[PDB]
């Protein structure tokens, strides 16, 4: 198979506005969303039915009672955060955790945090330490560092435990998340440019290009969700004769003008 | 995490060494810790592993063995007061605090 | 600093109400209640994961709990029964992965 990835983002809002939750945390398969909690909801729901499937009433019982404790903790650093800058008002807190299993069998795994919207605090898992933007974060990272017991506790989360749970969910969404849907391409001329469009793909990752008589200034149109699991995207341009190239999941496809 | 597995009763003599061993079956781990109860008294804390290997702390030392699902606590030059019983415990994917019956001491003056 | 828990011995007839206090100052989000009974171990009867949530043990039934603060975790016996004669040890844990701090128990014997 190909690389896929688990990952857990946890954003904080300190004195949010009305509606707008103090606390979400959101996990995901590669693109796919698998759970979701919050300060509103204050429950651990699946967002997949291949989640929602294969883990019975315990597991959500047992991550909602996890995920208020950790939206607890967040409040508190956050306000500490805050106090050691002098910041008043609304601040933004973000944490992002997981990790990679790649074609090789080889493992990745990371874990940093943002202060409003912020590169603050990244992980080393194989020096056990945190580097830090600026002072105040430095002081975060020397208490952590100082409990050697919880560095090592993280590396072993990343190595074993996250990939364990990366292994589970792919078996129970694996229909869903090693499928592959090819892209349907075609080209639209315009204004004097011609559009290589392609729909209706999954995975995401694709190549487009243009080339006059097979030799290679472009506009590119990102990759966008259709918002029914597959993606589109374009590719455009304004010699003689072009041809619009395109691979995906290890397949090259050719269209001649 | 469903089982673990330490010996109800160890009795070793004043001065000499101690390994009191705990075995635990589980798919899933957050780390392997023991404590110290003495009689009437609350347990406190002494270890924690989550890798292999050895932690030391005094005249105490800790060590783990991931693939055995094996731990043991060392007491050296022991003292008429690890006279305790001694709790092996350990956390599974869920962070679910399993206990195993606890180890008894008997210090032999 | 560590944790308070109150009182440390209770006598209860067959159906009285007790209530176990239970404190810490060290801001620990999580909070614990075991019975500890021959031969068994360390039974869960209740956690807290923060103040304004609480959830079962293995042995919830017949004790209630409340979080309120972060310092205070009280258990509830509703209806004192023979059965639950014990030693009760509250705890305190920063995380869910970071070592317990216990509380001095309390001797319970309930009877007819």
């Known amino acids: 198979m190909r690389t896929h990835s688990l990952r857990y983002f946890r954003l904080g809002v300190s004195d949010p506005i009305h509606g707008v939750p103090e606390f979400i945390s959101v996990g995901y398969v590669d693109s796919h969303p698998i759970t979701t909690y919050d300060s509103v909801t204050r429950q651990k729901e699946p967002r997949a039915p291949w989640m929602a499937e294969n883990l019975a009433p315990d597991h959500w019982e047992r991550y909602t009672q996890l995920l208020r404790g950790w939206q607890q903790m967040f409040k508190v650093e956050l306000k500490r955060l805050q106090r050691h800058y002098n910041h008043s008002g609304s601040h933004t807190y973000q944490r992002m955790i997981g990790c990679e299993l790649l074609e090789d069998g080889s493992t990745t795994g990371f874990l940093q945090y943002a202060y409003d919207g912020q590169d603050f605090l990244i992980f080393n898992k194989d020096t056990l330490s945190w580097l830090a933007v600026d002072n105040v974060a430095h002081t975060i990272k020397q208490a952590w560092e100082a409990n050697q017991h919880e560095l090592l506790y993280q590396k072993n989360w990343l190595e074993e435990e996250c990939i364990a749970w990366l292994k589970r969910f792919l078996e129970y969404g694996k229909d869903t998340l090693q499928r592959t849907e090819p892209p349907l391409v075609r080209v639209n001329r315009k204004e004097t440019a011609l559009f290589c469009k392609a729909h209706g793909f999954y995975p995401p990752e694709i190549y487009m290009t243009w080339m006059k008589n097979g030799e290679e200034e472009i506009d590119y149109g990102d990759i966008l969700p259709s918002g029914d699991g597959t993606y589109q995207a374009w590719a455009s341009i304004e010699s003689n004769l072009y041809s619009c190239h395109v691979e995906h999941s290890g397949v090259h496809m050719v269209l001649q003008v | 995490g469903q089982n673990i597995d330490q010996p109800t009763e160890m009795t070793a003599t004043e001065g000499a060494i101690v390994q009191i061993n705990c075995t635990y079956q589980t798919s899933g781990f957050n780390g392997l810790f023991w404590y110290q109860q003495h009689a009437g008294e609350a347990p406190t804390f002494l270890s924690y592993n989550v890798l292999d290997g050895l932690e030391e702390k005094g005249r105490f030392s800790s060590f783990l063995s991931r693939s055995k699902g094996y731990s043991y606590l060392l007491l050296k030059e022991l003292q008429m007061k690890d006279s305790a019983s001694y709790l092996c415990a350990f956390l599974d994917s869920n962070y679910q605090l399993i206990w195993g019956a606890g180890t008894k001491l008997i210090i032999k003056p | 600093a560590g944790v308070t828990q109150t009182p440390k011995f209770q006598v209860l007839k067959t159906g009285q109400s007790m209530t176990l206090q239970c404190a810490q100052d060290m801001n620990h989000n999580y909070m614990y209640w075991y019975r500890q009974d021959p031969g068994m171990g360390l039974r869960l009867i209740y956690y807290?994961?923060?103040?304004?949530?609480?959830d079962k043990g293995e042995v919830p039934n017949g004790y209630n709990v409340s979080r309120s603060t972060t310092e205070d975790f009280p258990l509830r016996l509703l209806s004192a029964a023979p059965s639950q004669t014990s030693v009760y040890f509250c705890?305190?844990?920063?995380?869910?992965?970071?070592?317990?701090?216990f509380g001095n128990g309390t001797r319970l014997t309930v009877t007819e």
């Open positions: 705890a305190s844990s920063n995380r869910e992965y970071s070592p317990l701090h």
């Open positions: 807290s994961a923060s103040e304004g949530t609480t």
